[PDB]
């Protein structure tokens, strides 16, 4: 099927014989070759706040947001022994492979015995009063253990809230997705053997919590991460996703793959007239597609989708001759032989100014291929002219009256 277009026609019809005609076949797809990579010098994302101090509790989770920086993901992952992970609308391999507009990390000290309380449908105290995961963005929840005690300082104990209500448990205050608990000020006092409930007389609020103990075991942490796409001009990229910068000045006019400040895709680049805003670096259409790019060399490049040349086969069964019609394209782009017709560039036809009355392989625009008893000929559809009659200048007129006749059956 890959030898030529007529064999692809035979394969598409799944038979060794097809009727004569002009058949559309698969287009000449141009796969992207060459790379245009443009990235800033950037900096290292500052994760030292996570390691410099004691991790907080689940109700008092700390948040780190990273934007326009590069981070060593392998070094960060090598410091933790991951026990489980759950990801939504993204995968960890894609996180290590691609770039994103922003990266948000929610980390807290969390015991691994309560891992089921951090899952999607859980209705225990953790999901009701401590932390509910937000699923408006691609998210990954990671639960890991810290093998070396010199990485993160060990907190005294694991602590969490069991219930938080105003007057009675029938008036409990539930936490929101990605937000802090209403009982945060009460839960800041801590929970130990002596203290298991805290009450405020002014607003009436009450908070009850439980605790574990950390004694000569590894620290267990929980990380809830989230990423965003297409919401910034700069990107957050792992250091394994950073490639060498190339130039577009030699790949213009052809389908190439690009990675422009973390935005990846394939397209055709042309030196276009600058439109849009220079500072935003990206121009989009109404369908959320990249159509332009303000580069760092001072030029504006308009991005176009990769296109394929339409291909048609002019097949004649009786003579077993085939010709290729490239619809609406000049013969230089394709580069008897090729020639330019009204319907595009044809290959395999011979032009001899032949005129035919009727023909069975119409190419359009009054052009058609005629088999010769051997290659097909490019011919034109004949317009017969009516018999011209000129009236005479008198009171009489000339009329053509039949003298012989036949009977025609319609």
């Amino acid at each position: 099927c890959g030898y030529d277009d007529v064999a692809q026609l035979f394969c598409s019809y799944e038979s060794f014989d097809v009727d004569s005609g002009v058949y559309s076949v698969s287009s000449f797809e141009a796969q992207p070759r060459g790379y245009f990579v443009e990235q800033p010098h950037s900096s290292e994302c500052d994760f030292s706040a996570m390691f410099s101090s004691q991790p907080p509790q689940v109700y008092n989770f700390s948040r780190l947001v990273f934007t326009n920086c590069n981070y060593n993901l392998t070094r960060l992952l090598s410091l933790f022994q991951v026990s489980e992970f759950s990801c939504h609308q993204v995968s960890p391999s894609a996180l290590a492979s691609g770039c994103y507009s922003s990266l948000t990390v929610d980390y807290f000290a969390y015991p691994l015995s309560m891992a089921s309380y951090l899952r999607q449908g859980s209705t225990g105290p953790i999901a009701q009063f401590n932390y509910k995961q937000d699923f408006t963005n691609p998210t990954c929840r990671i639960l890991a253990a810290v093998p070396s005690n010199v990485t993160i300082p060990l907190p005294q104990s694991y602590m969490w809230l069991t219930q938080c209500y105003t007057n009675s448990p029938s008036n409990s205050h539930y936490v929101e997705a990605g937000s802090y608990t209403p009982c945060l000020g009460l839960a800041s006092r801590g929970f130990n053997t002596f203290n298991s409930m805290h009450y405020d007389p002014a607003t009436g609020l009450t908070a009850t919590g439980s605790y574990q103990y950390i004694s000569e075991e590894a620290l267990e942490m929980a990380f809830i991460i989230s990423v965003q796409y297409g919401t910034d001009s700069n990107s957050v990229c792992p250091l394994q996703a950073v490639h060498n910068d190339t130039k577009v000045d030699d790949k213009l006019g052809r389908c190439i793959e690009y990675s422009l400040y973390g935005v990846t895709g394939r397209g055709v680049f042309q030196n276009c007239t600058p439109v849009g805003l220079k500072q935003q670096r990206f121009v989009y259409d109404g369908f959320d597609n990249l159509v332009g790019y303000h580069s760092d060399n001072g030029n504006y490049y308009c991005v176009r989708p990769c296109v394929s040349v339409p291909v048609s086969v002019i097949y004649d069964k009786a003579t077993n001759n085939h010709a290729t019609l490239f619809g609406s394209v000049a013969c230089e782009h394709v580069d008897a032989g090729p020639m330019q017709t009204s319907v595009g560039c044809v290959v395999g036809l011979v032009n001899t100014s032949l005129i035919v009355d009727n023909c069975q392989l119409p190419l359009g625009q009054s052009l058609c291929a005629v088999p010769a008893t051997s290659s097909l000929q490019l011919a034109t559809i004949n317009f017969t002219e009516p018999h011209m009659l000129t009236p005479i200048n008198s009171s009489r007129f000339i009329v053509e009256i039949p003298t012989n006749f036949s009977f025609g059956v319609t």
Binding site: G98, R266, S308, S328, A330, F383, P386, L389, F397, E400
Partner: protein, 336 residues
């Protein structure tokens, strides 16, 4: 003024390119749906073939066997130059009449481009979206010059005499005398027609002059022409804009799914996209088939209208035009 549509736009779709946009993983997943893509292509090919045969039948039926020259000085006091090819031609078509120029110029039609459409698209829009989405507008069977030839040969067609009911004789009678007999056949005596020659010619010329500036928003047949053009553009727009449907996937593009998910999730999202696009293509094929049969029936009605009004005088009141029909002229129009 009456517009009869004889054809629709011929569209063929590359099913593999439309569904997968040249992605190897999507093609591997679509190899399970090869027969449906083949059926879509074969159905579209059959519809386009039937359209070509319908157009050929239309232009075969309205052919004339005899024609007279109707230049100025031979048509009498009747100004028929609006129905004829201009002596100074600027239309890009050497056989297109002036009234066909007015018809074609005042209709908003995007030029598809059958010669260098790909080159014009890549040099600097549902026409440039053919090479992106994966479809192609097929050119019509005849170039506009041949259609203009066929329609202009009907204006000076020589027919049988008014009293001789039939089509076996070719009476070379001037246009003024033909109009005289056509007006006599509806109930006007010979004395009135002999005494009112100049007034009749003036009223005919006034009717044609008003026919010139009548392609405006108020005119309804012109609205029908624009409606046919808009129907073609709407079919192309639906075909092009169905590719942005996510169908429940995280993205409507294969590249984001490939770069944001692992293998199994990629398979599932790409399968959702494949199923949605195949269902959309099936709906498009059904719509194109329906429009093709409708256009074929309307082209047969156009054949009947030509044979009744253009090649003869109609005694059926209200069929050709309001009141007593005198003479009719047919000119080429977009899609009919």
């Amino acid at each position: 003024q009456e517009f009869i549509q004889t054809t629709i736009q011929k569209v063929t779709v590359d099913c593999k390119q439309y569904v997968c946009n040249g992605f190897e993983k999507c093609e591997q997943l679509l190899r399970e749906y090869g027969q449906f893509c083949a059926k879509i292509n074969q159905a579209l090919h059959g519809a386009n073939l039937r359209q070509d045969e319908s157009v050929s039948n239309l232009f075969s039926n309205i052919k004339t066997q005899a024609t007279q020259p109707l230049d100025a000085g031979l048509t009498g006091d009747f100004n028929l130059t609006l129905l004829q090819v201009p002596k100074v031609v600027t239309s890009q078509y050497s056989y297109r009449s002036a009234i066909e120029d007015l018809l074609f110029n005042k209709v908003t039609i995007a030029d598809p481009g059958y010669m260098q459409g790909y080159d014009e698209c890549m040099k600097q829009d549902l026409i440039c979206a053919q090479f992106v989405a994966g479809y192609k507008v097929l050119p019509p069977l005849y170039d506009p010059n041949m259609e203009s030839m066929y329609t202009t040969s009907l204006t000076g067609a020589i027919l049988g005499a008014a009293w001789t009911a039939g089509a076996s004789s070719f009476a070379a009678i001037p246009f003024a005398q033909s109009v005289f007999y056509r007006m006599n056949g509806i109930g006007i005596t010979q004395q009135v027609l002999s005494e009112n020659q100049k007034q009749i010619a003036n009223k005919f010329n006034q009717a044609l002059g008003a026919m010139q500036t009548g392609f405006t928003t108020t005119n309804l047949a012109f609205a029908k022409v624009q409606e046919a053009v808009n129907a073609n553009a709407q079919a192309l727009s639906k075909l092009a804009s169905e590719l942005s449907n996510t169908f429940g996937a995280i993205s409507s593009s294969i590249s984001d799914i490939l770069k944001r998910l692992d293998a199994v999730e990629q398979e599932a999202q790409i399968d959702r996209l494949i199923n949605g696009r195949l269902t959309s293509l099936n709906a498009f094929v059904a719509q194109q088939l329906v429009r093709s049969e409708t256009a074929a029936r309307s082209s047969q009605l156009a054949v009947d209208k030509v044979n009744e009004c253009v090649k003869s005088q109609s005694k059926r009141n209200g069929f050709c035009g309001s009141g007593n029909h005198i003479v009719s002229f047919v000119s080429n129009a977009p899609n009919g």
